Curated annotation (Swiss-Prot), chains A, B, C, D, E, F, G, H, I, J, K, L, M, N, O, P, Q, R, S, T, U, V, W, X, Y, Z, AA, AB, AC, AD, AE, AF, AG, AH, AI, AJ, AK, AL, AM:
Changing E6K: In CAA-APP; Italian type. Changing D7N: In CAA-APP; Iowa type. Coiled coil: none annotated. The gene is APP. The record marks M19 as: Susceptible to oxidation. Changing M19V: No free radical production. No hippocampal neuron toxicity. Changing V8C: Causes formation of an artifactual disulfide bond with PSEN1. It comes from the Eukaryota. The record marks F3, F4 as: Cleavage. Changing G17V: Reduced protein oxidation. No hippocampal neuron toxicity. This is P3(40). The record marks G17 as: Implicated in free radical propagation.
């Protein structure tokens, strides 16, 4: 019996695929 | 018996595909 | 028996496809 | 028996396709 | 038996195709 | 047996195709 | 047997094609 | 057997083609 | 057998082609 | 057998072609 | 000095409010 | 000084409120 | 000083309220 | 000095509010 | 000096608000 | 001196707000 | 001197806000 | 001197906000 | 002297924000 | 009996796929 | 002299933000 | 009895796939 | 003299932010 | 009885897959 | 003279941020 | 009875897969 | 003279940030 | 003269940041 | 009775898989 | 003259940062 | 009774798998 | 003349930073 | 009674697997 | 003339930084 | 009663597995 | 003339930095 | 003429830096 | 009563498994 | 002429730096 109590696989922060930052 | 209690795979934060930031 | 209780795959935050931010 | 209780794949937040923000 | 109880694929928030914001 | 109980693919929020906001 | 109970593809909110807002 | 019970593709809200709002 | 029960493609709300609102 | 029960393509609300509202 | 030279917010193409196309 | 030179909010194309095309 | 030079909100094309085209 | 040379926010293509296409 | 030479925020293609395509 | 030569924020392709495709 | 030669932030392909595809 | 020769931040492919594909 | 010859930050492939695929 | 009390596999921080930072 | 000859930061493949695949 | 009290496999910090930093 | 001949920081394969695969 | 009190396998710091730093 | 002949920092394979695979 | 009091297998520092640093 | 002939820092295989695999 | 003939610092295999495998 | 008081197997420092440093 | 003929510093096998395997 | 008071098997310093340093 | 014929500093096997295996 | 007071098996210094240093 | 014929400093076996195995 | 007061089996210095130093 | 025929300084077996095995 | 025929300085067995084995 | 006051079996200096130093 | 036929300085057995075995 493995009752999950809170979220599973949720994104509460940030995800970026591809970041490009020239100056 | 694996009752999920809260969200699964929800986005509560942020997702970006492709970020480009020249100055 | 895997009754989902709350949302699954919902977007409660933000999604951006492609962000471009020159100055 | 996998009765979904709340929304699935709903957008409760925001989706943007392509964001462009020069100054 | 996978009875959906609430909405599926509904937009309760916002969708934008293409956002452009010069100043 | 997958009886949908509420709306499917309804827009209860907002959709914009193309937003342009100069100042 | 997939009896739809409520609306499908209805617009209960707002749709805009192209929004332009200079000041 | 997919008996639609309520409206399909009805507009109960608002549709705008092209909105222009200078000040 | 897909008997439509209520309206299909009816406008119960509002449609605008082109809105222009200077001040 | 797709017997339509109520109206199809009827306007029960409002349609405007082109709205112009200066002040 | 932001002199607009050509049209602003003109429709040179097509706008449809609600399109329904059964066969 | 924002002198508009040509038309603003003119319809040079086509606007349709509600199109229904069974065959 | 925002002198409009040409037409504003004129219809030079076509407007249709409700188009129905069975065959 | 940001003189716009051609159109801004013009529709040279197509806009549809809500498209429904059963067969 | 940021003279825009061609169109800004014009729709030369297509925009759809909400597409529904059962068969 | 950042003279834009061609279009900025134009849609030459396609934008869809919400696509629903049951069979 | 950063003269942009071609398009910036144009959509030459496709954007979808929310895609739902049951069978 | 950083003259951009071709497109910057253009979408020549595809962007999807939220994809849901039950069977 | 860092002349960019081809595209920068263009999407020639595919971007998905959030993919959900139950069976 | 292995009841999970808090989140499992949630992102509370940051994820980047591919970071590129020339100067 | 660091002339970039081909693309920089382009997506020629695929990006996914958050993938969820129950069965 | 191995009750997990706090998070398991959560990212509270940072993850980068591939970092490239020329100067 | 460090002329880059082919792509730099391009994604020709695949990027996933967060993958969740229960069965 | 091996009750875990705090996190297990959490990332509170940093993870990099592949770091490349020419000058 | 350190002419790079092929790609630098390109992803020709796969990147995953966070993988979670219960059964 | 081997109650773990603090973290087990957590990364509070740094992990790098493959570091390459030419000059 | 240190001409690089093939790729440098490319990912032709696989990178995972954080893998969690309970059963 | 130290001409590199094949790849340098490429990942042709696999990299994992943090692996956690309870049963 | 072997109660662990602080961390076990935590990384509070640094781990590198493969370091390559030509000059 | 120290011409490298094959790969240098490539990963053709496997790298793991931190492995944790309770049962 | 062998109560461990501080860390066991923690890395507070540095670990390198394979170091290669040509000049 | 010290021509290297095969790989130098390549990982064809396995590298682990920190292995922890309680039972 | 053999209470360990400080760390056991901790790395406060440095570990290298395989060091290779040609010149 | 000291031509190396096969690999130098390659890992064809296994490297572990720090192994901890309580029971 | 053999209370250990300070570290046991800690590495405060350096460990190398295999050192190879041609010139 | 001291041609090395096979590997030099390769690890075909196993290397461990620090092994700790309580029971 | 001192041609080495097989391996030199290879590890075909095992190396341990520091072994600690309490019971 | 054999209370150990300082470290036991600690490495405060250096350990090398296998050293190979051709010239 | 002192042709070495088999291995020189290879470890086919075992090497331990520092062994500590209390009970």
């Amino acid at each position: 019996l493995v009752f999950f109590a809170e979220d599973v696989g949720s994104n509460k922060g940030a995800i970026i695929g591809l970041m490009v930052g020239g100056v």
